[PDB]
From a paper:
Rhodopsins mediate passive or active ion transport or metabotropic reactions in response to light and share a common architecture, consisting of a single polypeptide with 7-transmembrane (7TM) segments (opsin) and a retinal chromophore covalently attached to a conserved lysine residue via a Schiff base. ChRs mediate phototaxis in green algae and are exceptionally popular in neurosciences, where they are used to manipulate neuronal activity with light to study multiple aspects of brain function ranging from synaptic plasticity to network analysis. More recently, a ChR from Chlamydomonas noctigama ([name]) was identified as the variant with the most red-shifted absorption peak at 590 nm, which is more than 40 nm further red-shifted than all other ChRs. Therefore, [name] represents one of the most promising ChRs for both basic neuroscientific research and medical applications.
Here we present the crystal structure of [name] at 2.6 Å resolution, which reveals (i) the presence of an outer gate occluding the retinal Schiff base from the extracellular solvent, (ii) unique protonation state of the counterion residue destabilizing the protonated retinal Schiff base in the ground state, (iii) highly biased polar residue distribution toward the β-ionone ring, and (iv) tight association with the retinal chromophore to improve the retinal planarity, which appears essential for fast photocycle kinetics. As the expression level of wild-type [name] is very low in insect cells, we tested two [name] variants in which the extracellular N-terminal sequence was replaced by either the corresponding sequence of the Chloromonas subdivisa channelrhodopsin (CsChrimson) or the N-terminal sequence of CrChR1 (C1Chrimson). The two protomers in the asymmetric unit form a dimer, with each protomer composed of the extracellular N-terminal domain, 7TM helix bundle and the C-terminal β-hairpin loop region. The CrChR1-derived N-terminal residues mediate the crystal packing contacts between the layers in the lipidic cubic phase crystal and facilitate the dimeric interaction by forming the inter-protomeric β-sheet and three disulfide bonds. Although [name] is distantly related to the CrChRs (about 50% sequence identity over transmembrane region), the overall structure of [name] superimposes well with those of C1C2. In the current ground state structure of [name], the ion-conducting pore is closed by three constriction sites that restrict ion permeation, on the intracellular side (inner gate), at the middle of the membrane (central gate), and on the extracellular side (outer gate). In [name], direct hydrogen bonding between Glu139, Tyr159, and Ser288 interconnects TM2, TM3, and TM7 and constitutes the outer gate constriction. The crystals of [name] were obtained under low pH conditions, and the blue color of the crystals indicates that the current structure represents its red light-absorbing (protonated) state.
Residue numbers in the entry:
A (entry chain A): 58 to 114, 120 to 341
B (entry chain B): 54 to 115, 119 to 341
């Protein structure tokens, strides 16, 4: 595709108008790693289609939107993952997977909008809901910039992203505590706890996968990193929204057979005191 | 950085560069604008820089009442500073293997500021716990709008304009939701000075927000009429209106409503209104 010159110090290429960089030609992963990515992609696709069909087509727009985004994303990844602009190849020699950051920006705020109102629909939206959304957006923005950036700048932006993420994780964790005391005593408290465990395990893995992936320490290949992101998406997008959809109807069914008995009880969760709904 | 040194050798159809692991593309060496446009860009940058700092000093630093104005102007201070010193360095400006370039620093600016503006717009009146369901429709539609706009700038050829249209569909739903907020804000603030402020915020919002898709389609990520410097002039003027003039009025409005209630007392009446063909409950003074 090119030609050497001198003693390897000069390289010549055709003047055809196509950008050239040897650093863009690195391998994508091993044959076994590719097969695993294909397997997990089609599982994530097939589960989303099923969950879309289960949800239907309003109350419950969040789950639909998240799963619609998963279908679109996983479909574009199956067919045109390493094509620009799904994967961007920068003049600095590196590359970034912009298709994935776009996915996060569409779905992560919605998941958090669902989290701030897990229990019986309290239309009064708090200042906490805004704190989740704003911190999540800032987190992904500085994450995406760190993926495009290079050398020390990359890790400076990465750290800024972790600061945003911390506030988001903090606010998200306070939701799960308030959500627990706000749902019926039996089966509903377990689902909230299972949703919390699924949320932190999946959402906690992305920074780890980022730092060792092809946009960080270059340990994991793109194909390998794809397997890891597919599994997190299955838990964060599909398993979690199913539990959220399930939690709603179980709360509705409990109310029609028990009523709507609620007392305003005040307690402390984070560094403050909050009054929450109690059955 | 890319390669700026090369030699057009052979008949001109074969080019040679030093083999130093440095990416090379002639399409990246395009002009950034004229000396006049360069100056006009720098004038508008330092104006936005200075107004943002004055507003930040004016609002003062008190999850507080008025966090939106501070965050927006903080995003302004960070964006303009990075644009003044490192506008055309990567990743502020990204140069793709497809020959095109994109101003990612601007999309980052939008993603940080545009939702917060709409969060403020969702609650233009006083008090708290006023967001509800329109807010989410504003945020989700605004975010999707920027996301598909960013993808459009990264892409080339027909895909770019496909992504552009999808962004406009997102934007139209957002613009629609936004207009109903101003209609409801009019009927929920004191019938004197505050409604003139709300109407002025509405004009500034649409005139500034409506100009970004026009600048985009015509600038260096579109039909290539406006240079990067020229396109910077237009964006700075829109930012001064969208982020600085608009948040000052939002900050001013909140004072005027609080000063009104402090002397007039809190009196209200719930009115079942038709906003965009539906039953909306808007409380009036
Ligand atoms: C609801 C989901 C149910 C079943 C999903 C089954 C998933 C099985 C997906 C396997 C796909 C696969 O193995 O693809 C091989 C590849 O083509 C090698 O060349
Ligand atoms: C009810 C609505 C139904 C909607 C339709 C649902 C279709 C499910 C498709 C595949 C499932 C997984 C089967 C495994 C697919 C292997 C595909 C393959 O050959 O590999 C991918 C290829 O390499 C990439 O270009
Ligand atoms: C969920 C993702 C949202 C962004 C989708 C549109 C952006 C890029 C498409 C790139 C793939 C087109 C072929 C190259
Ligand atoms: C680049 C942007 C820099 C921003 C960092 C300095 C400015 C933050 C200070 C006050 C705003 C607090 C924001 C609170 C967001 C949640 C609001 C809430 O209600 O909780
Ligand atoms: C080369 C230089 C590149 C630029 C590098 C400098 C960037 C500094 C900006 C912000 C610091 C991080 C502040 C993170 C703000 C999070 C606070 C927040 O918004 O959350 C509020 C909370 O959730 C409700 O209480
Ligand atoms: C700091 C505390 C813990 C981080 C542990 C140390 C991990 C530092 C890895 C960041 C790094 O320097 O990576 C080098 C790479 O070549 C450049 O992108
Ligand atoms: C160690 C496994 C890590 C899995 C993620 C931790 C989840 C967790 O510990 O749950 C705490 C939460 O506060 C419950 O409400
Ligand atoms: C190798 C390990 C395989 C792990 C694969 C994890 C896939 C999770 C995907 C989506 C979540 C869907 C969860 C919903 C599953 C149905 C369970 C259910 O709720 O059924 C209720 C009914 O009462 C009982 O018959
Ligand atoms: C309303 C327009 C205001 C300022 C734009 C004028 C900027 C001056 C344009 C300079 C371009 C040039 O001089 O060529
Ligand atoms: C709507 C309200 C917002 C307008 C705010 C500022 C416009 C000020 C723009 C002034 C720009 C003048 C630049 C100029 O005159 O450039 C000279 C040229 O470069 C000779 O070579
Ligand atoms: C409210 C605060 C900003 C108000 C007005 C700024 C207008 C500034 C206009 C300055 C234009 C003159 C200039 O700077 O351009 C010099 C020109 O290049 C010589 O040939
Ligand atoms: C309570 C705290 C009160 C704080 C009070 C505010 C302090 C302002 C500080 C720094 C601004 C100085 C930077 C001013 C930038 C203007 C530069 C300019 O005018 O443009 C010329 C250009 O730099 C030619 O290269
Ligand atoms: C809070 C309100 C304060 C608002 C601010 C008050 C107005 C500042 C004056 C002029 C605008 C910018 C100054 C124009 C100078 C730009 C620098 C420049 O033009 O230098 C280019 C030169 O060609 C390099 O070689
Ligand atoms: C609003 C700002 C968004 C923050 C994201 C910062 C992105 C790139 C840093 C630009 C500096 C490039 C230095 C080389
Ligand atoms: C890839 C994007 C696919 C999007 C298209 C399929 C999803 C549309 C259906 C419901 C979501 C509605 C979102 C609007 C949110 C309104 C919130 C509200 O409260 O009203
Ligand atoms: C709340 C407002 C809801 C508005 C809903 C907007 C409808 C379009 C959504 C996704 C289109 C994705 C198609 C883009 C695919 C481009 C890649 C390709 O087609 O190749
Ligand atoms: C080149 C430019 C190409 C432009 C294409 C975009 C055109 C229209 C966007 C759709 C406008 C959205 C209208 C909102 C309708 C609405 O909100 O009503 C729904 C219901 O009342 C509440 O859920
Ligand atoms: C340039 C466009 C400036 C005019 C844009 C239309 C502004 C407008 O009509 O605002 C109406 C508002 O809804 C009243 O409450
Ligand atoms: C309300 C917003 C009013 C219009 C906003 C920007 C248009 C001004 C764009 C000026 C572009 C200058 C181009 C050039 O300098 O040539």
């Amino acid at each position: 595709s090119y030609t050497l010159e001198n003693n390897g110090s000069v390289i010549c290429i055709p003047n055809n108008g196509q950008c050239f960089c040897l650093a863009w030609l690195h391998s994508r992963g091993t044959p076994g790693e590719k097969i695993g990515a294909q397997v997990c992609q089609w599982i994530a696709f097939s589960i989303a289609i099923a969950l879309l069909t289960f949800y239907g087509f309003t109350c419950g727009w969040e789950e639909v939107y998240v799963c619609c985004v998963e279908v679109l994303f996983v479909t574009l990844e199956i067919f045109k993952e390493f094509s620009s602009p799904a994967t961007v190849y920068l003049s600095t020699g590196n590359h970034a997977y912009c298709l994935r950051y776009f996915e996060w920006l569409l779905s992560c705020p919605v998941i958090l909008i669902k989290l701030s109102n897990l229990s019986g629909l309290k239309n009064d939206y708090s200042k906490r809901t805004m704190g989740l959304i704003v911190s999540c957006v800032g987190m992904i923005v500085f994450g995406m910039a760190a993926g495009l950036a290079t050398d020390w700048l990359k890790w400076l932006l990465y750290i800024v992203s972790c600061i945003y993420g911390g506030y988001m994780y903090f606010q998200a964790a306070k939701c799960y505590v308030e959500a627990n005391h706000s749902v019926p005593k039996g089966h509903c408290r377990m689902v909230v706890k299972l949703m919390a465990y699924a949320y932190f395990a999946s959402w906690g893995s992305y920074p780890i996968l980022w730092a060792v992936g092809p946009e960080g320490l270059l340990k994991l290949s793109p194909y390998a990193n794809s397997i890891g992101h597919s599994i997190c998406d299955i838990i964060a997008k599909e398993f979690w929204t199913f539990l959220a959809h399930h939690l709603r109807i179980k709360i509705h069914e409990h109310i029609l057979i028990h009523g709507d008995i609620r007392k305003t009880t005040k307690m402390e969760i984070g560094g403050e005191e909050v009054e929450v709904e109690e059955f």
